[PDB]
Design a protein around this nucleic acid. Sequence first.
RNA 1: UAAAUCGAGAG
DNA 2: TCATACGCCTCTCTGCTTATCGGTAG
DNA 3: CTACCGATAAGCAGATCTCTCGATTGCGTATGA
Lengths: 43, 145, 172, 244, 98, 212, 98, 288, 49
Amino acid sequence: RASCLFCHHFRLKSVEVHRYACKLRLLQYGLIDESYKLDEITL
Amino acid sequence: LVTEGVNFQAMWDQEAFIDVDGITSNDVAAVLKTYGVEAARNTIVNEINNVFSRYAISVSFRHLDLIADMMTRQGTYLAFNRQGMETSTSSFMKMSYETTCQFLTKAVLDNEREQLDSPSARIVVGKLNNVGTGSFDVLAKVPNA
Amino acid sequence: SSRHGQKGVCSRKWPTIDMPFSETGIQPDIIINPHAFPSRMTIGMFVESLAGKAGALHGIAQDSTPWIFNEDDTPADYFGEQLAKAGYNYHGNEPMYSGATGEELRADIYVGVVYYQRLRHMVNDKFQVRSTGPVNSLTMQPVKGRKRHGGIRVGEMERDALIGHGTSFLLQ
Amino acid sequence: MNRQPTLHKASMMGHKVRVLPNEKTLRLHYANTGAYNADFDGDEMNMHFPQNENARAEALNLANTDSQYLTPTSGSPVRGLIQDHISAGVWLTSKDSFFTREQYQQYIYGCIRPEDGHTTRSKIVTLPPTIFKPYPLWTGKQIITTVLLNVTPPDMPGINLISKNKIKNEYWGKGSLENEVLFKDGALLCGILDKSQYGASKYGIVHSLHEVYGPEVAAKVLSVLGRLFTNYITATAFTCGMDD
Amino acid sequence: DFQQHEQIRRKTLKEKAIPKDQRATTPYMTKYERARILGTRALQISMNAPVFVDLEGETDPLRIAMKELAEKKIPLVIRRYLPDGSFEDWSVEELIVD
Amino acid sequence: ENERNISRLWRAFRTVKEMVKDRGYFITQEEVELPLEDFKAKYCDSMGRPQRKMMSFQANPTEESISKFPDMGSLWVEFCDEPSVGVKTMKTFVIHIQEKNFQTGIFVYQNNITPSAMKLVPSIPPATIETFNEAALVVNITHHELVPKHIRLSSDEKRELLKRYRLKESQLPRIQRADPVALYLGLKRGEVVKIIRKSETSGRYASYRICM
Amino acid sequence: KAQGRTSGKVPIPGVKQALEKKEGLFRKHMMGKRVNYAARSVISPDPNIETNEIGVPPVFAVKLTYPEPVTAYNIAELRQAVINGPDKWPGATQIQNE
Amino acid sequence: GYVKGRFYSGIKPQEYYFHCMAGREGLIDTAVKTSRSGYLQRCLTKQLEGVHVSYDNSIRDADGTLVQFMYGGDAIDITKESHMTQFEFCLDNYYALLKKYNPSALIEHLDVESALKYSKKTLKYRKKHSKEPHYKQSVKYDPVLAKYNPAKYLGSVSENFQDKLESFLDKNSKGVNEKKFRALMQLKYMRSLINPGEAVGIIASQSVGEPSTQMTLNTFHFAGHGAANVTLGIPRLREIVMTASAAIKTPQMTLPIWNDVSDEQADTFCKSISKVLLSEVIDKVIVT
Amino acid sequence: LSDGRTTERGSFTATVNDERKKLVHEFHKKLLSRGKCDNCGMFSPKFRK
RNA sequence: UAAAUCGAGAG
DNA sequence: TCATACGCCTCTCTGCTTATCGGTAG
DNA sequence: CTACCGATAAGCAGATCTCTCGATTGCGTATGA
Ligand SMILES: [Mg+2]
Ligand SMILES: [Zn+2]
């Protein structure tokens, strides 16, 4: 449902994609505080 | 004085007539949201004990304390149902509890691996339990050469 | 059971010698524990005991339709008059001797005759025992059913209780 | 043994086995009815037979009935005699109960059978009669005292207990002190043993015996008292009638 | 081929092993431990394990094991498991009954 | 009306001072037990207006607080005069926090605050900015009977406790980041807390939660 | 999830229906199973057992068995039980070899 | 419904009708009370089947997630908590209790002095720091249970038990001395500790659910002149535990009042704080 | 990993499971939120059931 | 010997 | 005339989830 | 002006211990005899 037919990517942005990917990868190791601190890399 | 509804901020203004240091309520979610986890645990114990005062079966507070600390083990007013159950490492016990289809789908979708800790999982696999007599191991001392 | 909703299972077949005997040589055929009455409050059985005793003594039948007696015609007194005329104790008691010691009991025993009816629910229909036998096909577990020589079920409550004891090898 | 529903822990204990070659039904003592919440309303309860020594030892020590004396719900006792033994105790421990040598010795040996190991010492020891002349006369409280003194292990002082019972003083006459139960070095000196002494009543004689001499001595005391109040109830039966 | 598999498990096993000098668990032998040790010892005797305690015509392995524990000669070693996986190794001889 | 509003503002100020002291900054019994006559003599106009501009203050760590937490920084507060929250009224505060180099920032508003600040408050690391409400601090929550004594637990003590019980930060009982207790303590996530529960069957016994 | 039924006779349960409700495989065959070596009958009271035994009728005592292993001290009692056989209590029903 | 008869002398037919009606009510309530506990029991035991006391005297789920560090703050078995407050009974049976405990064999595997000194220091600290607001109690020495293992260090007891023991030894002056009695009582507290392995979760679940089987529409139905009538029984228990309802049927709070506020100047506050609807002041309406 | 805070196998506990569920559910909900694809601009029609 | 539904039910 | 194999033939509680309509940024 | 965010209202989904006996098991139909 949340996909684009043409570009064949998620209908959300491609930078939130990597944000959530990195968040899940880091939190998988039980680094909870680091997962929330990652969002501070915004600029 | 006892009211008929919960709203802590209403009487906080009226300091003259009410000693706001002892406002205890029949609610639990409001207590958790406006007074933190520990006040919620205290009110949980109080409201599960006063239900045993009327209909007097006195019960030791150790069981009530364990119940409250399990109800608030994640900092929120959890519950002993399927809505407050998914937050567990072993899904064998959840799917044994109820909604086997619901919990199995999540368990396999994220490749959740059960480490065989809960008694129900050990029973399903068929391994010696981990509580009580099975909480340790026994070694035989042999005098070889 | 009697005609007042007093169940009871025959606990033991008491031999007649060990059975307590009375002054006249009457050994009762049924013992009902007196502690039942204070909670059940089946005073109808107590009245029926002495009414039946009087009826059997005098060779008559006493009607027991509700609302014949009243406050000033108490059935206890009314049947006690007949019992006293017959020559027994006015209160329905009766001297009794233990069948083992042979000595008279401390107080006279309340003895009478009451209408007793057997019940259909037997005991052999509740019997069950299984060591080994038939098993299920898809689970390799004992079958269900008394006639099928199947086992009893140790359900969720029994499993949880077996855990609560701290017993684990019992659970296994 | 288990009496469904197994609501709490005590509804599944481990009993020892006694093979009575007479009947076709399971035979169970009266102390377990309160714990099982069972009846004798034609109740049917299961009987599992563990098959490995692990399970045997685990049921004999952890799940055995003696160790389950106090329910973990509130610490109150859950065992004890119930219905006729209580009235038998009330009658036997009163002041009117005097026994000659015959009755005293018979009542004692009817419940302190040493061949089965009920008592420790190889010889049943008795007590001097409370009356010497015109002829020896014991008392029911003396029966209780010597029963305790024979089941209580030797090389250990008797119970020093002071308690009460449900029967008020004014129901025993004037100036009576039977409402208060008193012990002194394993000897009963005052009061009667109603429900508040054996049964599901806290701070009783059997409860104190448990806490002092372990659970096995409490179980033996309960069994011995049940046997004594049964043999005594056949000699002088308790009955109710219309006159009451 | 197999050493890398074996060495990693022994290091982990030696890691969780609490040193004898710093075991801070209950010195007494708990009821569960008594039951388990008695059962396992009785099983060993039933399987013809040697016994150094004299038997006075006794036939019950559980009673034999209880006698052994009372006289304190059980050749068994407990292994108390801490929740993380650390284990301490007490012995029955140094354990206190009740 | 005006006297009631002034009393409420006063009580909020007292709660703020007490919360700073509990967090561990140098605060005396004065400016906490400030009487009404003194408050109306000091923080009042010719008619008695709140004039909340001069109610702002700084908080510096005590020597004991520095010894316990070597990295504990400074704190700043500001009470908004306007009934709402102004976008630029928060920009000035947020730039001033970094301008004066304050490690922690506490903000208080009157009724409501524009959602943009929610998106903007966690923007300047390592500085932390928190927001509170005047009507939500009329009475302190740590003074309540059910609420136990929450005391923050140091990193060395956290390591000692974890080594003693052989635990992980995740395996401790968890306390949320939105409770009025954790916000009162200013407890950064990952720090273990210590709770002194007045247990009915054990008197005083201590339990440790972790904010995560 | 099946669609289409006007009168029918019974909606056939699926695989998910075999593991979902109380009658499902989980709560009926894994959290509790029927057991071997177990009996069930009526209980009758008996103030002649020491409040820790049970009165097993001989009809039970001829069915339930325990697999006692033979050994150097159990030989006499087990030999007597075997000689008695499955009908005379105490007795043996099966002699399981090694 | 008021009947003057007695079961010994019979009852008139109207009284018999009323008695039958009451018996019918009881018979229905028996079925309801038999039906109303299973789901609560099952859910509680399913949730708590794993949590058990570990070898550190800390109860935690089979996963490892802690629930409490101390079992109730004390870690004494409930089945053995019976006679740790009966000071008179313990003093009277001192000799038998000591012979049972055998303190002679409980020294080479025990430490007494460190725990005793720490407990004494803590006790005198709280004695100095008894009367003051709770939020001001800056703890310098945590309770002795925190560091010293109560099953390894003699004298490590709860603050309630220690306070009660000291109060008893102060009030009651008894040939045995107070020191030997205190040593035996501390040994009793050590011996009455919940063993590591207890299925404490199942114990708690059963102790909360099994008594729930004995509650139904009891005599607690009050209609004297007026009351709040909050929920109770297993409906309230299900609301509290099973559902965690944030919209409970009868939410209310307790408001303590200052001791200088009498019945007057408080009744008017109650009336002012109470809700009044528009309908409660309109006598009627005349729509033309 | 270096200081022993988490073995290479990862630490799966109740709180990390909670955070996994919260983050994943919120991330899916945000996926289902909008309708225009801000990756190529060429948005696509949704599907019904 | 199955499996499902209904009635009588027992604790 | 007419039998067995195919073809279907109206009086309870808790959540969660999504649709639609108010307000605010740009 | 118009896109984004919540705030109800309706629908969706799921809940409200063991065992023994007895009884029972569909109409419609359509072509080969
Ligand atoms: Mg029953
Ligand atoms: Zn696209």
